[PDB]
């Protein structure tokens, strides 16, 4: 808004892992204010991570974020009669936001039947430095570096 | 309403199902409230005059 920056509302950390970083994810995944369903999926998905790997799910999840979270993004800019996608440094706050959004979005587009599996499988893919949410982070970087000229 | 229509509403009809409300002030058929037996227009006016007991502009 015009007046200035606004007080960013805080979320509580969570009754298992004690993680603000992962309460956010319930809220990204939540639909129609059904927080229970999203909690259930999350927690089920994290069990599935722990069984397949052996490592702590939280850990794999935070490894996964690092690979999904972008650093540079282009931004649409009309100058004259042609657009110049201008590269910008992503703010630390926005990095997480784009991290979780892409995780949740591309999780839902997977072909696995249940969401807990789709989420889990997508979280594992990011840790493997491949998948859809990673390919998104690759493609945002490619565009940013392609338009490195501008500043 | 027409005088005929007001009269015919006041007369007892052939069947009770045929019986309908009008505004007792102005004879309007639509939007007649049963508590007051007034249409929405007449109700507003008389409420503003303080001539409908206990009725005041609401806000919450």
């Amino acid at each position: 808004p015009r007046k200035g920056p606004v007080a960013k509302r805080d979320v509580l950390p969570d009754p298992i892992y004690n993680s603000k970083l992962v309460s956010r994810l319930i809220n990204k995944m939540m639909i129609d204010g059904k927080k229970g369903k999203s909690q259930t999926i999350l927690y089920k998905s994290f069990d599935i991570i722990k069984e397949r790997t052996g490592n702590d799910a939280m850990e794999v999840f935070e490894q996964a974020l690092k690979n999904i979270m972008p650093v540079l993004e282009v931004k649409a800019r009309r100058v004259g009669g042609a657009n110049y996608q201008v590269p910008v440094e992503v703010r630390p706050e926005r990095r997480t936001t784009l991290g979780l959004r892409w995780l949740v979005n591309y999780a839902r587009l997977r072909g696995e039947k249940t969401m807990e599996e789709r989420l889990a499988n997508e979280i594992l893919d990011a840790a493997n430095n491949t998948g859809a949410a990673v390919k998104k982070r690759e493609d945002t970087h490619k565009m940013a570096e392609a338009n490195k000229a501008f500043a | 309403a027409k005088k005929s229509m007001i009269a015919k509403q006041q007369r007892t009809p052939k069947f009770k199902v045929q019986e309908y409300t009008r505004c007792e002030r102005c004879g309007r058929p639509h939007s007649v409230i049963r508590k007051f037996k007034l249409c929405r227009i007449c109700f507003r006016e008389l409420a503003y005059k303080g001539q409908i007991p206990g009725v005041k502009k609401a806000s919450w």
Binding site: - | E24, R25, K37, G50, Q51, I52, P53
Partner: protein, 204 residues
């Protein structure tokens, strides 16, 4: 676009005219009161009546009339008031007790003031004169403010318009401000003129 000033203030600083509770009979009583207030207004047209408070308790109707000419309403001892009472007993079919109070300064009662202007407009007085004079007389009676408006085909004009005059303060948004308000009409040969009057007597 402007709310009725009386309407805004009822149950705040103003009080209801009809001062009675009912549950079952509420609609029946309401249309009795309408029939009364109609009748009183028709009969006591020239007698400078404004408010007509109505109260009820059992088969009984207490009618506190407010008038600037109480002698004209009452008449010779209590001749005309009894003729009114007996006429209301025909309409109501109840006991009708009629109190009659005085308005001390009739230029502070909005309804009287509005009707004055309306009567003058029917008698072919210039809307400019009719208004301007009342503005003075209300201010003389010690009103803290007064607005008056006359609207319609002023001076038998083809195009209607609203000329208005004001004096002092009339703070319509201030809720505790006792702002009396009233309207009246004048059936001229070029249709209806309409009057409106705001009188600010003071704070509460």
């Amino acid at each position: 676009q402007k709310v009725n000033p009386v309407g805004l203030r009822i149950g705040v600083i103003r009080d209801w005219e009809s001062k009675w509770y009912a549950g079952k009979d509420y609609a029946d009583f309401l249309h009795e009161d309408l029939k009364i207030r109609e009748y009183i207004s028709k009969r006591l047209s020239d007698a400078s009546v404004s408010k007509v408070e109505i109260e009820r308790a059992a088969n009984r109707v207490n009618i506190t009339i407010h008038t600037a000419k109480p002698g004209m309403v009452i008449g010779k001892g209590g001749s005309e008031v009894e003729a009114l009472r007996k006429a209301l007993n025909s309409l109501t079919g109840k006991r009708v007790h009629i109190n009659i109070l005085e308005i001390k300064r009739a230029d502070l009662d909005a309804q009287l003031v509005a009707d004055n202007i309306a009567r003058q407009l029917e008698n072919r007085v210039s809307f400019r004169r009719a208004q301007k004079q009342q503005i003075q007389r209300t201010m003389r009676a010690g009103a803290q403010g007064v607005k008056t408006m006359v609207s319609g085909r002023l001076g038998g004009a083809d195009i209607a318009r609203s000329e208005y005059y004001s004096e002092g303060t009339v703070p319509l948004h201030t809720l505790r401000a006792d702002i009396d308000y009233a309207t009246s009409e004048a059936d001229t040969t070029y249709g209806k003129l309409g009057v409106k009057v705001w009188i600010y007597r003071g704070e509460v």
